[PDB]
Amino acid sequence: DPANIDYTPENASSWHNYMRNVAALLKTDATNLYNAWNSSYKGGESYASLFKAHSGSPYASALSCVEEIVDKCAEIANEVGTAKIGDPYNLYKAGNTEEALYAVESWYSWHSRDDYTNNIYSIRNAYYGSLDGNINANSLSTVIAGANSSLDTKIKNAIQKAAKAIQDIPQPFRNHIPSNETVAAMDACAELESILKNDLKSYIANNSNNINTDAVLNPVVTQYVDAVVVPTYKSLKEKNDALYNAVIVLADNPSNSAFETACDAWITAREPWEKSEAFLFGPVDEMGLDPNMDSWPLDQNAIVQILNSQSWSDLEWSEGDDEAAVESAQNVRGFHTLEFLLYKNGEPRKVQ
Ligand SMILES: [Cl-]
Ligand SMILES: [Mg+2]
Ligand SMILES: [Mg+2]
């Protein structure tokens, strides 16, 4: 029932206000995340400076930075295969097909394949030290290549295999959950997680390989922060600002065209977010910005209740609120709540 709700003339006013409020919070969260890295964190030094310096806490060496980088790449490869794809797959295989269909992150917009593929490109970006698919001179890839060309080539191939396997699932993944292609994508993601957390991490950690000193890894950490992390968060800030502006256009003059234009802005803003999921550490994690912007699944019953009662304060939480209160607010806001409000069955919603 909450899944079947339509945007109608009867609820349009409330629907516009829900969209405005969710888009304003996404704008705030992306700005605060970018500022935490680029300007100041916890009222002090910027997180970009703290990470690049690695002078004690939580990173005392360039190796500690790089182990976090690699751990966080392995974590997203694990999340994508075992949970984003795996949770719907295992529900479906057990015979719980209706629960499986609604378990797919980004199904409202039929965007799961592209979303999860961008998560793998986050790994590529972290490993390449770039955003354009070109291997940077100061990348982890180049460091591994100089010591072990075979391991570097196997890692680059494993990243590409996972991205290609997800793209090979027939569009949309929501309608092809039990496919052979789904299983091949899970396999490719598991192989990628393994080569990162086992082979790569162990190889860098071994002092005998001479690639874990600050002289070797400082330029890798600096380039990862300056060319990957900070520009991705800058792009997310800019694109969440544009997404809010597109929601305002739609709310002020609702039309099929304005819904289509706001949906395009949602995909545009999602890209730097999805391409940041290999670095879910530091500010995005500690500030709770990851679940603020990207909780999934949502509390769909609570969304419909908030829409009909215009209880906008239910979307927000404060420092010191208990865990349940924070999660309840996060489960009714963010990119996926805005996605619900903009899309129906993979297409922009229409004005009746
Ligand atoms: Cl989908
Ligand atoms: Mg168009
Ligand atoms: Mg997530």
PDB file of C-alpha atoms in Angstrom, residues 99-338:
ATOM      1  CA  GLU A  99      10.377  -9.131   0.172  1.00  0.00           C
ATOM      2  CA  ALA A 100      13.326  -9.522  -2.288  1.00  0.00           C
ATOM      3  CA  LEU A 101      11.878  -7.066  -4.803  1.00  0.00           C
ATOM      4  CA  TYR A 102      11.499  -4.312  -2.251  1.00  0.00           C
ATOM      5  CA  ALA A 103      14.992  -4.938  -0.787  1.00  0.00           C
ATOM      6  CA  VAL A 104      16.881  -3.572  -3.819  1.00  0.00           C
ATOM      7  CA  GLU A 105      18.661  -0.264  -3.092  1.00  0.00           C
ATOM      8  CA  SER A 106      17.797   2.258  -5.892  1.00  0.00           C
ATOM      9  CA  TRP A 107      14.984   0.117  -7.372  1.00  0.00           C
ATOM     10  CA  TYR A 108      12.468   3.042  -7.375  1.00  0.00           C
ATOM     11  CA  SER A 109      14.464   4.612 -10.217  1.00  0.00           C
ATOM     12  CA  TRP A 110      15.683   1.222 -11.711  1.00  0.00           C
ATOM     13  CA  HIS A 111      19.142   2.607 -10.902  1.00  0.00           C
ATOM     14  CA  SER A 112      20.632  -0.267  -8.808  1.00  0.00           C
ATOM     15  CA  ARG A 113      23.007  -1.499 -11.523  1.00  0.00           C
ATOM     16  CA  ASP A 114      24.457   1.986 -12.124  1.00  0.00           C
ATOM     17  CA  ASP A 115      24.546   2.767  -8.399  1.00  0.00           C
ATOM     18  CA  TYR A 116      26.487  -0.410  -7.474  1.00  0.00           C
ATOM     19  CA  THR A 117      28.760  -0.022 -10.547  1.00  0.00           C
ATOM     20  CA  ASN A 118      29.643   3.519  -9.356  1.00  0.00           C
ATOM     21  CA  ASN A 119      30.484   1.951  -5.898  1.00  0.00           C
ATOM     22  CA  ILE A 120      33.031  -0.265  -7.705  1.00  0.00           C
ATOM     23  CA  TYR A 121      34.336   2.833  -9.589  1.00  0.00           C
ATOM     24  CA  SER A 122      34.907   4.331  -6.107  1.00  0.00           C
ATOM     25  CA  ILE A 123      37.401   1.444  -5.560  1.00  0.00           C
ATOM     26  CA  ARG A 124      38.951   2.134  -8.985  1.00  0.00           C
ATOM     27  CA  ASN A 125      39.322   5.841  -8.115  1.00  0.00           C
ATOM     28  CA  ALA A 126      40.941   5.030  -4.721  1.00  0.00           C
ATOM     29  CA  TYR A 127      43.406   2.589  -6.330  1.00  0.00           C
ATOM     30  CA  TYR A 128      44.162   4.799  -9.425  1.00  0.00           C
ATOM     31  CA  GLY A 129      44.439   8.064  -7.422  1.00  0.00           C
ATOM     32  CA  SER A 130      42.138   9.772  -9.968  1.00  0.00           C
ATOM     33  CA  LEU A 131      38.507  10.291 -11.014  1.00  0.00           C
ATOM     34  CA  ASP A 132      38.910   9.817 -14.810  1.00  0.00           C
ATOM     35  CA  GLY A 133      39.910   6.140 -15.061  1.00  0.00           C
ATOM     36  CA  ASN A 134      43.576   7.031 -15.773  1.00  0.00           C
ATOM     37  CA  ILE A 135      46.267   5.665 -13.458  1.00  0.00           C
ATOM     38  CA  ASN A 136      47.982   8.545 -11.610  1.00  0.00           C
ATOM     39  CA  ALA A 137      51.769   8.684 -11.185  1.00  0.00           C
ATOM     40  CA  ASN A 138      51.091   8.955  -7.390  1.00  0.00           C
ATOM     41  CA  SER A 139      48.626   6.086  -7.072  1.00  0.00           C
ATOM     42  CA  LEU A 140      48.666   2.898  -5.025  1.00  0.00           C
ATOM     43  CA  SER A 141      48.409   1.115  -8.447  1.00  0.00           C
ATOM     44  CA  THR A 142      51.742   2.622  -9.562  1.00  0.00           C
ATOM     45  CA  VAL A 143      53.419   1.637  -6.215  1.00  0.00           C
ATOM     46  CA  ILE A 144      52.222  -1.969  -6.574  1.00  0.00           C
ATOM     47  CA  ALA A 145      53.153  -2.019 -10.302  1.00  0.00           C
ATOM     48  CA  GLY A 146      56.797  -1.126  -9.461  1.00  0.00           C
ATOM     49  CA  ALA A 147      57.100  -4.028  -6.966  1.00  0.00           C
ATOM     50  CA  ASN A 148      54.722  -6.599  -8.419  1.00  0.00           C
ATOM     51  CA  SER A 149      53.235  -6.006 -11.878  1.00  0.00           C
ATOM     52  CA  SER A 150      51.287  -9.301 -11.709  1.00  0.00           C
ATOM     53  CA  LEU A 151      49.454  -8.362  -8.459  1.00  0.00           C
ATOM     54  CA  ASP A 152      48.710  -4.828  -9.769  1.00  0.00           C
ATOM     55  CA  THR A 153      47.298  -6.209 -13.046  1.00  0.00           C
ATOM     56  CA  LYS A 154      45.192  -8.803 -11.142  1.00  0.00           C
ATOM     57  CA  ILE A 155      43.743  -6.028  -8.901  1.00  0.00           C
ATOM     58  CA  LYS A 156      42.946  -3.730 -11.899  1.00  0.00           C
ATOM     59  CA  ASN A 157      41.348  -6.685 -13.699  1.00  0.00           C
ATOM     60  CA  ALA A 158      39.326  -7.669 -10.578  1.00  0.00           C
ATOM     61  CA  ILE A 159      37.937  -4.103 -10.300  1.00  0.00           C
ATOM     62  CA  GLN A 160      36.923  -4.120 -13.999  1.00  0.00           C
ATOM     63  CA  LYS A 161      35.456  -7.661 -13.723  1.00  0.00           C
ATOM     64  CA  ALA A 162      33.150  -6.541 -10.833  1.00  0.00           C
ATOM     65  CA  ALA A 163      32.004  -3.358 -12.622  1.00  0.00           C
ATOM     66  CA  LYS A 164      31.380  -5.316 -15.876  1.00  0.00           C
ATOM     67  CA  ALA A 165      29.542  -8.154 -14.018  1.00  0.00           C
ATOM     68  CA  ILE A 166      27.148  -5.702 -12.372  1.00  0.00           C
ATOM     69  CA  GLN A 167      26.523  -3.946 -15.739  1.00  0.00           C
ATOM     70  CA  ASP A 168      25.886  -7.434 -17.275  1.00  0.00           C
ATOM     71  CA  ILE A 169      22.872  -7.986 -14.995  1.00  0.00           C
ATOM     72  CA  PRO A 170      19.905  -7.277 -17.325  1.00  0.00           C
ATOM     73  CA  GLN A 171      18.324  -3.881 -16.729  1.00  0.00           C
ATOM     74  CA  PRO A 172      16.767  -3.479 -14.175  1.00  0.00           C
ATOM     75  CA  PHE A 173      18.369  -5.699 -11.515  1.00  0.00           C
ATOM     76  CA  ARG A 174      15.080  -5.457  -9.504  1.00  0.00           C
ATOM     77  CA  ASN A 175      13.401  -7.595 -12.282  1.00  0.00           C
ATOM     78  CA  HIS A 176      16.324 -10.003 -12.751  1.00  0.00           C
ATOM     79  CA  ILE A 177      17.224 -10.861  -9.114  1.00  0.00           C
ATOM     80  CA  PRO A 178      17.690 -14.675  -9.519  1.00  0.00           C
ATOM     81  CA  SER A 179      19.567 -14.292 -12.851  1.00  0.00           C
ATOM     82  CA  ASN A 180      22.834 -16.110 -13.568  1.00  0.00           C
ATOM     83  CA  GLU A 181      24.276 -12.591 -14.076  1.00  0.00           C
ATOM     84  CA  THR A 182      23.390 -11.688 -10.461  1.00  0.00           C
ATOM     85  CA  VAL A 183      25.366 -14.720  -9.184  1.00  0.00           C
ATOM     86  CA  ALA A 184      28.360 -13.766 -11.482  1.00  0.00           C
ATOM     87  CA  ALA A 185      28.265 -10.214 -10.031  1.00  0.00           C
ATOM     88  CA  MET A 186      28.271 -11.572  -6.472  1.00  0.00           C
ATOM     89  CA  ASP A 187      31.211 -13.850  -7.366  1.00  0.00           C
ATOM     90  CA  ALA A 188      33.177 -10.960  -8.984  1.00  0.00           C
ATOM     91  CA  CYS A 189      32.556  -8.690  -5.955  1.00  0.00           C
ATOM     92  CA  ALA A 190      33.710 -11.469  -3.530  1.00  0.00           C
ATOM     93  CA  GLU A 191      36.870 -11.986  -5.642  1.00  0.00           C
ATOM     94  CA  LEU A 192      37.536  -8.227  -5.588  1.00  0.00           C
ATOM     95  CA  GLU A 193      37.031  -8.046  -1.757  1.00  0.00           C
ATOM     96  CA  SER A 194      39.449 -10.983  -1.353  1.00  0.00           C
ATOM     97  CA  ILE A 195      42.239  -9.522  -3.555  1.00  0.00           C
ATOM     98  CA  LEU A 196      42.018  -6.200  -1.642  1.00  0.00           C
ATOM     99  CA  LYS A 197      41.814  -7.375   1.983  1.00  0.00           C
ATOM    100  CA  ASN A 198      43.940 -10.487   1.696  1.00  0.00           C
ATOM    101  CA  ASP A 199      46.483 -10.141  -1.168  1.00  0.00           C
ATOM    102  CA  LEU A 200      46.912  -6.361  -1.407  1.00  0.00           C
ATOM    103  CA  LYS A 201      46.766  -5.486   2.284  1.00  0.00           C
ATOM    104  CA  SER A 202      49.132  -8.316   3.231  1.00  0.00           C
ATOM    105  CA  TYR A 203      51.592  -7.402   0.432  1.00  0.00           C
ATOM    106  CA  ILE A 204      51.813  -3.693   1.430  1.00  0.00           C
ATOM    107  CA  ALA A 205      52.099  -4.638   5.169  1.00  0.00           C
ATOM    108  CA  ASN A 206      55.100  -6.904   4.588  1.00  0.00           C
ATOM    109  CA  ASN A 207      58.209  -4.769   5.332  1.00  0.00           C
ATOM    110  CA  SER A 208      60.175  -7.081   2.925  1.00  0.00           C
ATOM    111  CA  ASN A 209      58.327  -5.531  -0.043  1.00  0.00           C
ATOM    112  CA  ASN A 210      59.751  -2.046   0.782  1.00  0.00           C
ATOM    113  CA  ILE A 211      56.455  -0.244  -0.046  1.00  0.00           C
ATOM    114  CA  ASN A 212      55.109   0.693   3.401  1.00  0.00           C
ATOM    115  CA  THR A 213      57.445   3.541   4.414  1.00  0.00           C
ATOM    116  CA  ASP A 214      56.262   7.145   4.704  1.00  0.00           C
ATOM    117  CA  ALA A 215      58.680   8.057   1.833  1.00  0.00           C
ATOM    118  CA  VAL A 216      56.768   5.619  -0.478  1.00  0.00           C
ATOM    119  CA  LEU A 217      53.201   6.107   0.792  1.00  0.00           C
ATOM    120  CA  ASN A 218      53.029   9.843   1.734  1.00  0.00           C
ATOM    121  CA  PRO A 219      52.547  10.872  -1.988  1.00  0.00           C
ATOM    122  CA  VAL A 220      49.865   8.145  -2.350  1.00  0.00           C
ATOM    123  CA  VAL A 221      47.935   9.495   0.686  1.00  0.00           C
ATOM    124  CA  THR A 222      48.294  13.121  -0.478  1.00  0.00           C
ATOM    125  CA  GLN A 223      47.100  12.374  -4.031  1.00  0.00           C
ATOM    126  CA  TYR A 224      44.203  10.167  -2.726  1.00  0.00           C
ATOM    127  CA  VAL A 225      42.998  13.028  -0.490  1.00  0.00           C
ATOM    128  CA  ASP A 226      43.581  15.949  -2.938  1.00  0.00           C
ATOM    129  CA  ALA A 227      42.467  14.303  -6.219  1.00  0.00           C
ATOM    130  CA  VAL A 228      39.932  11.665  -5.103  1.00  0.00           C
ATOM    131  CA  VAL A 229      38.305  12.325  -1.692  1.00  0.00           C
ATOM    132  CA  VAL A 230      38.055  16.141  -1.572  1.00  0.00           C
ATOM    133  CA  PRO A 231      36.998  16.681  -5.280  1.00  0.00           C
ATOM    134  CA  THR A 232      34.344  13.883  -4.938  1.00  0.00           C
ATOM    135  CA  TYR A 233      32.868  15.604  -1.847  1.00  0.00           C
ATOM    136  CA  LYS A 234      33.087  19.035  -3.599  1.00  0.00           C
ATOM    137  CA  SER A 235      31.152  17.566  -6.568  1.00  0.00           C
ATOM    138  CA  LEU A 236      28.547  16.069  -4.175  1.00  0.00           C
ATOM    139  CA  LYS A 237      28.141  19.471  -2.462  1.00  0.00           C
ATOM    140  CA  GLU A 238      27.688  21.247  -5.843  1.00  0.00           C
ATOM    141  CA  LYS A 239      25.323  18.608  -7.185  1.00  0.00           C
ATOM    142  CA  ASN A 240      23.189  18.436  -4.022  1.00  0.00           C
ATOM    143  CA  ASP A 241      22.855  22.247  -4.298  1.00  0.00           C
ATOM    144  CA  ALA A 242      21.711  21.764  -7.950  1.00  0.00           C
ATOM    145  CA  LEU A 243      19.331  18.970  -6.855  1.00  0.00           C
ATOM    146  CA  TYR A 244      17.712  21.266  -4.251  1.00  0.00           C
ATOM    147  CA  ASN A 245      17.310  23.995  -6.956  1.00  0.00           C
ATOM    148  CA  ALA A 246      15.666  21.481  -9.325  1.00  0.00           C
ATOM    149  CA  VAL A 247      13.278  20.403  -6.483  1.00  0.00           C
ATOM    150  CA  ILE A 248      12.351  24.082  -5.936  1.00  0.00           C
ATOM    151  CA  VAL A 249      11.614  24.510  -9.678  1.00  0.00           C
ATOM    152  CA  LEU A 250       9.357  21.389  -9.556  1.00  0.00           C
ATOM    153  CA  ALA A 251       7.604  22.417  -6.309  1.00  0.00           C
ATOM    154  CA  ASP A 252       6.913  25.955  -7.666  1.00  0.00           C
ATOM    155  CA  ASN A 253       5.619  24.786 -11.072  1.00  0.00           C
ATOM    156  CA  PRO A 254       4.817  21.078 -11.047  1.00  0.00           C
ATOM    157  CA  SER A 255       4.816  19.365 -14.412  1.00  0.00           C
ATOM    158  CA  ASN A 256       5.935  16.147 -16.068  1.00  0.00           C
ATOM    159  CA  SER A 257       8.929  18.105 -17.493  1.00  0.00           C
ATOM    160  CA  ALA A 258       9.971  19.433 -14.055  1.00  0.00           C
ATOM    161  CA  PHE A 259       9.701  15.913 -12.552  1.00  0.00           C
ATOM    162  CA  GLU A 260      11.925  14.569 -15.414  1.00  0.00           C
ATOM    163  CA  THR A 261      14.419  17.449 -14.848  1.00  0.00           C
ATOM    164  CA  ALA A 262      14.502  16.823 -11.034  1.00  0.00           C
ATOM    165  CA  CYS A 263      15.037  13.049 -11.685  1.00  0.00           C
ATOM    166  CA  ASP A 264      18.014  13.921 -13.944  1.00  0.00           C
ATOM    167  CA  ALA A 265      19.365  16.075 -11.065  1.00  0.00           C
ATOM    168  CA  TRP A 266      18.900  13.134  -8.643  1.00  0.00           C
ATOM    169  CA  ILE A 267      20.977  10.787 -10.856  1.00  0.00           C
ATOM    170  CA  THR A 268      23.623  13.591 -11.255  1.00  0.00           C
ATOM    171  CA  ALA A 269      23.897  14.099  -7.467  1.00  0.00           C
ATOM    172  CA  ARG A 270      23.945  10.381  -6.759  1.00  0.00           C
ATOM    173  CA  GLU A 271      27.029   9.843  -8.931  1.00  0.00           C
ATOM    174  CA  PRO A 272      29.676  11.529  -6.666  1.00  0.00           C
ATOM    175  CA  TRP A 273      27.919   9.987  -3.613  1.00  0.00           C
ATOM    176  CA  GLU A 274      28.046   6.455  -5.084  1.00  0.00           C
ATOM    177  CA  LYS A 275      31.640   7.090  -6.234  1.00  0.00           C
ATOM    178  CA  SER A 276      32.498   7.957  -2.574  1.00  0.00           C
ATOM    179  CA  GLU A 277      31.357   4.643  -1.050  1.00  0.00           C
ATOM    180  CA  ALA A 278      34.895   3.138  -1.025  1.00  0.00           C
ATOM    181  CA  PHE A 279      35.779   5.818   1.560  1.00  0.00           C
ATOM    182  CA  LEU A 280      33.003   5.529   4.185  1.00  0.00           C
ATOM    183  CA  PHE A 281      35.344   6.522   7.047  1.00  0.00           C
ATOM    184  CA  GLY A 282      36.174   9.614   9.065  1.00  0.00           C
ATOM    185  CA  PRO A 283      33.653  12.494   8.840  1.00  0.00           C
ATOM    186  CA  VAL A 284      30.989  10.734   6.713  1.00  0.00           C
ATOM    187  CA  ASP A 285      30.880   7.888   9.312  1.00  0.00           C
ATOM    188  CA  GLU A 286      31.455   9.704  12.624  1.00  0.00           C
ATOM    189  CA  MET A 287      28.988  12.526  11.798  1.00  0.00           C
ATOM    190  CA  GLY A 288      26.317  10.021  10.717  1.00  0.00           C
ATOM    191  CA  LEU A 289      26.194  11.625   7.249  1.00  0.00           C
ATOM    192  CA  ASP A 290      26.224   8.256   5.447  1.00  0.00           C
ATOM    193  CA  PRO A 291      22.870   7.109   7.053  1.00  0.00           C
ATOM    194  CA  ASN A 292      21.612  10.778   6.920  1.00  0.00           C
ATOM    195  CA  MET A 293      21.953  10.761   3.109  1.00  0.00           C
ATOM    196  CA  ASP A 294      21.740   7.123   2.103  1.00  0.00           C
ATOM    197  CA  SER A 295      19.688   4.984   4.488  1.00  0.00           C
ATOM    198  CA  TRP A 296      18.146   1.891   2.927  1.00  0.00           C
ATOM    199  CA  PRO A 297      15.570   0.354   3.309  1.00  0.00           C
ATOM    200  CA  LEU A 298      13.279   3.201   4.306  1.00  0.00           C
ATOM    201  CA  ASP A 299      10.395   3.225   6.754  1.00  0.00           C
ATOM    202  CA  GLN A 300       7.806   3.505   3.910  1.00  0.00           C
ATOM    203  CA  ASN A 301       4.831   3.454   6.334  1.00  0.00           C
ATOM    204  CA  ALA A 302       6.343   6.362   8.304  1.00  0.00           C
ATOM    205  CA  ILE A 303       7.046   8.301   5.015  1.00  0.00           C
ATOM    206  CA  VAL A 304       3.324   8.090   4.066  1.00  0.00           C
ATOM    207  CA  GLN A 305       2.334   9.114   7.638  1.00  0.00           C
ATOM    208  CA  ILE A 306       4.768  12.119   7.573  1.00  0.00           C
ATOM    209  CA  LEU A 307       3.496  13.117   4.104  1.00  0.00           C
ATOM    210  CA  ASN A 308      -0.174  13.090   5.218  1.00  0.00           C
ATOM    211  CA  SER A 309       0.402  14.797   8.573  1.00  0.00           C
ATOM    212  CA  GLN A 310       3.180  17.235   7.342  1.00  0.00           C
ATOM    213  CA  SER A 311       5.204  16.292  10.484  1.00  0.00           C
ATOM    214  CA  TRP A 312       8.497  17.670   9.020  1.00  0.00           C
ATOM    215  CA  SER A 313      10.324  17.672  12.365  1.00  0.00           C
ATOM    216  CA  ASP A 314      10.270  13.800  12.176  1.00  0.00           C
ATOM    217  CA  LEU A 315      13.012  14.121   9.478  1.00  0.00           C
ATOM    218  CA  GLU A 316      15.523  15.666  11.885  1.00  0.00           C
ATOM    219  CA  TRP A 317      17.568  14.528  14.908  1.00  0.00           C
ATOM    220  CA  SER A 318      19.923  16.273  17.358  1.00  0.00           C
ATOM    221  CA  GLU A 319      23.291  15.409  18.886  1.00  0.00           C
ATOM    222  CA  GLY A 320      22.544  13.381  22.015  1.00  0.00           C
ATOM    223  CA  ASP A 321      19.242  11.869  20.697  1.00  0.00           C
ATOM    224  CA  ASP A 322      19.104   8.127  21.322  1.00  0.00           C
ATOM    225  CA  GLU A 323      20.042   5.617  18.581  1.00  0.00           C
ATOM    226  CA  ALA A 324      16.351   4.769  17.786  1.00  0.00           C
ATOM    227  CA  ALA A 325      15.398   8.465  17.369  1.00  0.00           C
ATOM    228  CA  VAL A 326      18.367   9.081  15.041  1.00  0.00           C
ATOM    229  CA  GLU A 327      17.621   5.951  12.925  1.00  0.00           C
ATOM    230  CA  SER A 328      13.876   6.803  12.732  1.00  0.00           C
ATOM    231  CA  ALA A 329      14.720  10.242  11.258  1.00  0.00           C
ATOM    232  CA  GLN A 330      17.345   8.787   8.866  1.00  0.00           C
ATOM    233  CA  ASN A 331      14.867   6.133   7.606  1.00  0.00           C
ATOM    234  CA  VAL A 332      12.460   8.844   6.322  1.00  0.00           C
ATOM    235  CA  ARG A 333      14.916  11.273   4.678  1.00  0.00           C
ATOM    236  CA  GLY A 334      17.953  11.225   2.373  1.00  0.00           C
ATOM    237  CA  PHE A 335      18.496  10.325  -1.268  1.00  0.00           C
ATOM    238  CA  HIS A 336      16.196   7.323  -1.200  1.00  0.00           C
ATOM    239  CA  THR A 337      13.233   9.179   0.305  1.00  0.00           C
ATOM    240  CA  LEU A 338      13.673  11.844  -2.390  1.00  0.00           C
TER     241      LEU A 338
END
